[PDB]
Design an enzyme around this catalytic site. Structure first.
Site, PDB file in Angstrom:
ATOM      1  N   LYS A 105       0.800  -1.271   0.000  1.00 39.35           N
ATOM      2  CA  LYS A 105       0.000   0.000   0.000  1.00 39.35           C
ATOM      3  C   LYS A 105       0.804   1.277   0.000  1.00 39.35           C
ATOM      4  O   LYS A 105       1.961   1.270   0.521  1.00 39.35           O
ATOM      5  CB  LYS A 105      -1.105  -0.254   1.033  1.00 39.35           C
ATOM      6  N   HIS A 159      -7.808 -11.778 -10.471  1.00 41.31           N
ATOM      7  CA  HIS A 159      -8.341 -10.675  -9.644  1.00 41.31           C
ATOM      8  C   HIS A 159      -9.676 -10.272 -10.267  1.00 41.31           C
ATOM      9  O   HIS A 159      -9.765 -10.058 -11.485  1.00 41.31           O
ATOM     10  CB  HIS A 159      -7.312  -9.537  -9.689  1.00 41.31           C
TER      11      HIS A 159
END
Lengths: 437, 435
Positions: free
Chosen positions: B152, B273
């Site tokens: 992140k 994904h």
């Protein structure tokens, strides 16, 4: 959040003029109780950077009431090809309506429009050829060449190679374009190679007894690009001479953008016919989820479709303009294309010859492809004459001739009058008087 | 329509039995005031023919909103090259154009059954967690939990700071992946970032003495640019190229993106994904298909892994995605040895919740892509990822966490970092742990 992804003092005009931001308009509702500008900071952030150098996706406007959120996404956010230099629709949707579509503090969220600036717009493919290519085969003026009359082969599935080729031959004695219905591929009972060799033949006979060039749109839709390519290549080399008379249909919805991009770059000399196979829940009754048909279609030009199934029934005429002009006003944003080839609307329906002119008048042209039902083709004399009246109705429209005067010297258009006598009074009273009788 | 397309005297056992008919089951409601059976018979006509071969509705329940239809395997297209099935067809024929209708309100596919003959023409996974297990130097049969994270934040870190954040994490966890959009942005180009992430791999692997995995996003529009990232990304990992998962955003780029990866790099974990999906997949959508059908479809396509959920969606999904014989909401599928598709659980699963989850699920055979299981520990994220391993090894061994938590600090401290879950899941913790 809040102060990070919300900048309500931003003039949308500056942003447009800046040319460094993509802007998106959505009709999202914050779940039961959640702050309105707080959620939109959150929907912006999830879309953007999680956890500010113009990497941040700002919320330049909200309209709490109307449930209207506008977000500006810097162009640097958007992935680009390592190979080409070229932008991609896959990135675009990922950022813009990726799993921001899955949040838990948003009832529903639907994208209604989007603006693409020059820096960004220009990195995209755009259409390679259009109707223009069809016109030039058909021996029409490449600028404003007119109506291309087509069907689909009913039944959608269950016709062996010959029955199928014969349905094609037959239809091409009146009409200009046939397109394989949605699942027509390589079923065991009607193989692609057998059928496409036969259909190739039906063109030759049709062309020769008619003296007019005929058009075919063959689906090459597949899961594997090399398979997609396999087909593209077996079809175009079996039509040989008539290679340039073939359009390549790729169900771009249900097979993804890699399928649409495979044909687009592989065969850039042929019409890429984008089937809108079944948007449904996304492009819908107002599936408060995803995007609308306006955006789906606007996105396809950027992708490179030559033509795309567009509409029948603010309208699919708004879509039409956005797709074909160099400057078009969408529901929220006005878009320029800086000379990007237009994408031809493929209208579905079946107006009939007497209603045909009406269609062309509200639209302002006849530069569409009409994949008419076998209904638009109904006539007392048939679908050979049904289809001819459709053609006949464009020429009188085009030329300026009163239809009824034109009908007098034109058989099938004339016999149409009578084929739908109910609509004739309504639309054109005294037609019988002028002769039909 | 009607009579032609309907035949409610057909037994579902029978159609299973011959194994020459794909059966789908839907939740549909006809519009305004159209007969239930009629609408269905029309829908059968819209998918199939319209004018076996013909698609036949064999079971209706108007009260429940149920249409069950039998599509002959003959209708289903296949490659001219391979001779193999395609998902695009399965989708155009049973989902498509048919989707859109008037006299038809909503219809959602809730489950499907693929005969023997037909289930066998699809690709199916090529690799799955046992490949990850074999690289992490674990057992390829019940090798357990793989500890990961999404690096992140999503976008912004430049090549170097990205590489170094990765390395940080890899000192306590096992798997790290690229976010829904990370790729070849101007401010952090792919060549520059993959090159430098390759090193951080070699570094942390050298310090730690453990094999580590990366999941590189190679999604793109053009299959030849997908292949290009694919190839670039493994050429640059060099020796560590069996450690790279290739992450394809299969909902957003489509079937062709999935199958370019699956077929051109068959020896690497194809991490599927599903960014997006929530639209058509929505649990608040009455159109498209459910998550069960999304992921049931993915095994066939051949994803090696798929984001599965946290929390008869998943419990059922999990078994469908990994067993050789799973039961779905309507149909019992048999997969005749077609490799499994590993769930990839995401969310905020600290180390306290781990134990129960493995107890409900039954194994620990998934990849966890943690955020607030990891980044939430009071002692930082490395400590966090070490707490998950530890919770895992506890469960594994038959040691009861408060026990395992005494010898192990990261685990002692989980309880301290999420006291809400402690309070609630481990009573006496304060006491037992002592302090």
């Amino acid at each position: 959040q809040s102060s990070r992804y919300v900048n309500l003092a931003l003039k949308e005009e500056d942003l447009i003029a800046g040319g460094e931001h993509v802007l998106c308009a959505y009709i999202m509702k914050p779940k039961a109780g959640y702050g309105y500008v707080a959620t939109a900071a959150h929907f912006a952030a999830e879309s953007s950077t999680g956890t500010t150098r113009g990497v941040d996706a700002l919320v330049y406007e909200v309209d709490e009431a109307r449930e209207l959120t506008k977000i500006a996404y810097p162009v640097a956010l958007f992935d680009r090809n390592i190979t080409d230099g070229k932008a991609m629709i896959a990135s675009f949707l990922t950022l813009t309506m990726g799993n921001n579509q899955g949040m838990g503090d948003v009832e529903y969220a639907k994208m209604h429009d989007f603006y693409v600036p020059e820096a960004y717009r220009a990195l995209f493919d755009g259409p390679s050829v259009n109707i223009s290519a069809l016109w030039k085969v058909l021996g029409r003026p490449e600028v404003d060449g007119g109506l291309v009359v087509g069907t689909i082969i009913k039944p959608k599935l269950g016709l062996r190679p010959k029955p199928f080729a014969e349905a094609c031959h037959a239809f091409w004695l009146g009409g200009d374009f046939i397109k394989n219905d949605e699942p027509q591929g390589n079923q065991p009972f009607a193989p692609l190679r057998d059928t496409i060799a036969l259909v190739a033949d039906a063109m030759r006979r049709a062309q020769d007894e008619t003296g007019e060039a005929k058009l075919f749109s063959a689906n090459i839709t597949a899961d594997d690009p090399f398979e997609i390519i396999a087909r593209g290549e077996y079809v175009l080399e079996t039509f040989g001479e008539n290679a340039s008379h073939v359009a390549l249909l790729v169900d771009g919805y249900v097979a993804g953008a890699a399928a649409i991009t495979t044909a687009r770059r592989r065969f850039p000399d042929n019409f890429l016919h984008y089937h809108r196979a079944g948007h449904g829940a996304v492009t819908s009754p107002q599936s408060k989820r995803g995007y609308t048909a306006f955006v789906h279609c606007k996105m396809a030009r950027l992708q490179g479709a030559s033509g795309i199934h567009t509409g029948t029934m603010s309208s699919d005429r708004a879509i039409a303009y956005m797709l074909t002009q160099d400057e078009a006003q969408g529901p929220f944003y006005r878009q320029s294309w800086g000379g990007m080839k237009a994408c031809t609307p493929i209208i579905s329906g079946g107006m009939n010859a007497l209603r045909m002119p009406g269609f062309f008048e509200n639209l302002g042209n006849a530069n569409v492809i009409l994949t008419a039902g076998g209904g638009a083709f109904g006539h007392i004399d048939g679908p050979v004459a049904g289809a001819r009246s459709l053609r006949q109705a464009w020429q009188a429209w085009r030329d300026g001739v009163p239809v009824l005067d034109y009908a007098r010297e034109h058989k099938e258009l004339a016999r149409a009058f009578e084929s739908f006598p109910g609509d004739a009074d309504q639309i054109y009273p005294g037609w019988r008087k002028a002769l039909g009788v």
